[PDB]
Amino acid sequence: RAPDSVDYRKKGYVTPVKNQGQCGSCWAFSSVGALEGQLKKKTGKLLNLSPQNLVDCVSENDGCGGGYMTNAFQYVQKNRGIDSEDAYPYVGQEESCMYNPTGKAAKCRGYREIPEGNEKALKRAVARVGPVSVAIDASLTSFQFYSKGVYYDESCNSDNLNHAVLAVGYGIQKGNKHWIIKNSWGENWGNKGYILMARNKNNACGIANLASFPKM
Numbered sequence: 001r002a003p004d005s006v007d008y009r010k011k012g013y014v015t016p017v018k019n020q021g022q023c024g025s026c027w028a029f030s031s032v033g034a035l036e037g038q039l040k041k042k043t044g045k046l047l048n049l050s051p052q053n054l055v056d057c058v059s060e061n062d063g064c065g066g067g068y069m070t071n072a073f074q075y076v077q078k079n080r081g082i083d084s085e086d087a088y089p090y091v092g093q094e095e096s097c098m099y100n101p102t103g104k105a106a107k108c109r110g111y112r113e114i115p116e117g118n119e120k121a122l123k124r125a126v127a128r129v130g131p132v133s134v135a136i137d138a139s140l141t142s143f144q145f146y147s148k149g150v151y152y153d154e155s156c157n158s159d160n161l162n163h164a165v166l167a168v169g170y171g172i173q174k175g176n177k178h179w180i181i182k183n184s185w186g187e188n189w190g191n192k193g194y195i196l197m198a199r200n201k202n203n204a205c206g207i208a209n210l211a212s213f214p215k216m
């Protein structure tokens with residue numbers, strides 16, 4: 001059995017909260033967050049990886065028009081690397097691919113998709129692998145104005161995924177099981193950039209429907 005609670009913020013696996021701006025690069029932030037966790041586990045060092053590298057260079061995605069995290073991990077593998085944020089900084093608009101192997105800060109040997117809808121498998125992956133890339137329905141006004149507590153809205157649509165975020169842990173708050181979710185809308189959004197989302201509540205907001213992690 002996995003631990004009852006896991007919080008990778010407490011383990012030094014999670015970089016500061018970023019702000020993607022208007023660019024539809026949620027997928028790229030979700031992807032780099034999962035890579036950053038694996039890089040810390042493998043090398044002992046926490047550093048910011050480049051979402052702009054992904055935006056500009058993953059041709060299977062649509063840059064600031066959106067993308068998938070699976071395609072991002074596939075690119076890092078096929079490309080034999082991803083650059084650091086410092087080497088390839090975020091500008092929030094699409095530009096020509098500027099990937100440089102001199103700035104390479106991580107590699108990827110593959111990825112794994114979590115079995116669809118399986119929150120227990122997602123829990124075990126978070127516990128035993130690290131932070132996991134996830135997609136959710138973030139379209140409700142109640143999500144937009146999240147402040148505190150465990151987020152649950154009966155109107156959330158588990159069949160309508162429209163945002164990519166990072167599951168950095170899980171636990172329980174006053175009896176309500178949750179996922180600890182890192183967003184990419186700045187520290188001013190939510191609770192210092194984070195939201196606790198209902199866990200084991202009928203796959204609320206589709207949290208386990210499009211989850212994946214990279215391998216290093």
Ligand SMILES: *[C@]1(O)CO[C@H]2[C@@H]1N(C(=O)[C@H](CC(C)C)NC(=O)c1ccc(-c3csc(N4CCN(C)CC4)n3)cc1)C[C@@H]2F
Nearest residue numbers: 024025026027060061062065066067068135161162163164
């Ligand atoms: C996030 O910033 C949240 O708001 C934005 C952005 N979104 C996404 O990235 C979502 C995330 C999923 C639900 C995990 N993804 C998409 O909406 C998405 C995925 C793929 C594509 C795609 C790939 S190739 C391609 N095109 C279209 C255009 N033609 C000319 C070339 C190929 N499109 C697009 C969008 C959701 C929201 F967009």
Ligand code: NA
Nearest residue numbers: 060070071074
């Ligand atoms: Na692909």
